[PDB]
Design a protein around this ligand. Structure first.
Ligand SMILES: Cc1cc2nc3c(=O)[nH]c(=O)nc-3n(C[C@H](O)[C@H](O)[C@H](O)COP(=O)(O)OP(=O)(O)OC[C@H]3O[C@@H](n4cnc5c(N)ncnc54)[C@H](O)[C@@H]3O)c2cc1C
Ligand SMILES: CCCCCCCCCCCCCCCC(=O)OC[C@H](COP(=O)(O)OC[C@H](O)CO)OC(=O)CCCCCCC[C@H]1C[C@H]1CCCCCC
Ligand code: HEM
Ligand code: NA
Length: 403
């Protein structure tokens, strides 16, 4: 457990670790994979643009420093990570390995700046976070195992049907190879597909949202073909499209993810969507509009009228359900689009213009859409005094630029 002095060192040096985030992880991967090549089967071997990783890593460091004094908020941010780990199959025995190589990388990259007190402070941080995560992950693993149709680790599934949806999206209907029941899931949750990639000679793992509603015997995932041209094609999405066919088998993780409506609660729900179309959003919409009345507000952030399927399905739902408010934003409306009728406000979703409508007592906020969009709204809500534990966001579905 961290003493106040230790916490002060972490807070004072976070800006420096953030600064070298990308160089640190780059060196970390290099060291760890030479010592433990087996771990390449769990980590994503696809290279990402330096600029984006740096941003993401810097944000992670600042998030820790910002919530280190608030255990309630820290646990909130950690539960999203615990779920991702459970899906990937992260084990307790792997924490010491990651810790060693990560600390060696920090010391190497920081050079002079890496004093003895700084390394020890972050070594304690790592140890504390590892302790907490392992426990949370242990609980998740345990809960799944004891669920009807649940399991731990990988379970083999067979592709029953493969249905092309468009020129880039294809759906896969999966059934367990053992023909037994499959554990339920909540819309918003995902599974992880573990598959060998010939080009790499390694196994790779990727998450995919679970489509529709649970039926006790099959799952459906919708996969968008990634990459091409300027961008090197994605490994798993193209592999699934071109080389995984009806009859083949893949390994799946049991459902995980903290992003999903709590159908037990009776508090208000605020949904902020920045591009996600009817997939699997109608499933989550259904849950939100379930019995009995719950105060629901939907904020649809679209570009304009070109694609307006989600916009209409919503006005359809808003027409019927009484406790439902809908707002539409167009970041680049058309000449034929006129405020007050085709939409409510221009530009990207700006919660500041509908504060009266979203500042509901005891509300939970669910945000989906592009990653940059989700971060933006998350931060906007924090500025309005909303607690971390009340903000929920996650990559949801095959196309975050649907409408
Ligand atoms: C919780 C969750 C749910 C998800 N749900 C869905 C879903 O329902 N449907 C879906 O389609 N996807 C979903 N995803 C995304 C999915 O997990 C994969 O990320 C996606 O399929 C792409 O994987 P890949 O193996 O094809 O690409 P990777 O090989 O991982 O490549 C990733 C990207 O990097 C680009 N790239 C590759 N090499 C380089 C390089 N050297 N320099 C620069 N750029 C490069 C690739 O073109 C691609 O765009 C979800 C993700 C999460 C976290
Ligand atoms: C780089 C120095 C690491 C310092 C080690 C001490 C731990 C500090 C970080 C702890 C962060 C805990 C809360 C962060 C909240 C959150 O998860 O932020 C969201 C964003 C992303 O969220 P979005 O907004 O995109 O959604 O996170 C990132 O994208 C991080 C990507 C990490 C990928 C590399 C994984 C490496 C894995 C082995 C372990 C490395 C050790 C821990 C690294 C932690 C950075
Ligand atoms: C105290 C230690 C740890 C912390 C704080 C940590 C934190 C994180 C964070 C913030 C993410 C991204 C979360 C997200 O995208 O939602 C992540 C991803 C990941 N973590 Fe953990 N993690 C820790 C330990 C581990 C360990 C021990 C392993 C196991 C080998 C591991 C494997 C992964 C993998 C594979 C990913 C996915 C990204 C990728 O493929 O590179 N993590 N971790
Ligand atoms: Na070690």
């Amino acid at each position: 457990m961290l003493t106040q002095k230790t916490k002060d060192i972490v807070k004072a040096t976070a800006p420096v670790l953030a600064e070298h985030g990308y160089d640190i992880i780059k060196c970390f991967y290099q060291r760890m994979f030479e010592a433990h090549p087996e771990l390449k089967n769990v980590f994503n071997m696809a290279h990402q643009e330096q600029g984006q990783q740096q941003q993401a890593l810097a944000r992670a460091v600042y998030a820790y420093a910002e919530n280190i004094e608030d255990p309630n908020s820290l646990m909130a941010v950690l539960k999203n990570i615990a779920n991702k780990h459970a899906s990937l199959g992260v084990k307790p025995e792997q924490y010491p390995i990651v810790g060693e190589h990560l600390l060696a990388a920090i010391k190497e990259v920081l050079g002079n700046a890496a004093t003895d007190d700084i390394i020890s402070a972050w070594a304690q941080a790592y140890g504390n976070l590892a302790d907490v995560l392992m426990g949370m992950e242990s609980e998740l693993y345990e809960r799944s195992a004891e669920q009807p149709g649940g399991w731990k680790g990988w379970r083999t599934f067979v592709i029953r049907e493969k249905r092309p949806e468009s020129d880039v999206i294809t759906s896969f209907i999966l059934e367990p190879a053992d023909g037994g029941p499959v554990v339920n899931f909540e819309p918003g949750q995902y599974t992880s597909v573990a598959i060998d990639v010939p080009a790499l000679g390694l196994q790779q793992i990727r998450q995919y949202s679970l489509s529709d509603m649970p039926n006790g015997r099959t799952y459906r995932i919708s996969v968008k073909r990634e990459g091409g041209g300027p961008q090197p094609p994605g490994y798993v999405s193209n592999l699934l499209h071109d080389h995984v066919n009806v009859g083949d088998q893949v390994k799946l993780a049991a459902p995980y993810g903290s992003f999903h409506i709590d159908v037990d609660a009776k508090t208000p729900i605020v949904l902020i969507s920045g591009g996600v179309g009817l997939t699997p959003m109608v499933s989550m919409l259904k849950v939100a509009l379930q019995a009995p009345p719950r105060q629901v507000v939907f904020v649809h952030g679209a570009r304009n009228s070109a694609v307006h399927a989600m916009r209409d399905r919503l006005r359809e739902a808003a027409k019927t359900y009484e406790n439902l408010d809908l707002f539409v934003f167009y970041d680049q409306p058309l000449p034929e689009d006129v405020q007050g009728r085709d939409y409510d406000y221009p530009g990207l979703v700006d919660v500041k213009q509908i504060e009266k409508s979203i500042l509901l007592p005891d509300a939970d906020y669910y945000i989906c859409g592009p990653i940059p969009f989700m971060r933006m709204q998350h931060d906007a809500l924090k500025n309005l005094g909303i607690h971390e534990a009340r903000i929920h966001y996650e990559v949801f579905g095959p196309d975050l630029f649907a409408e």
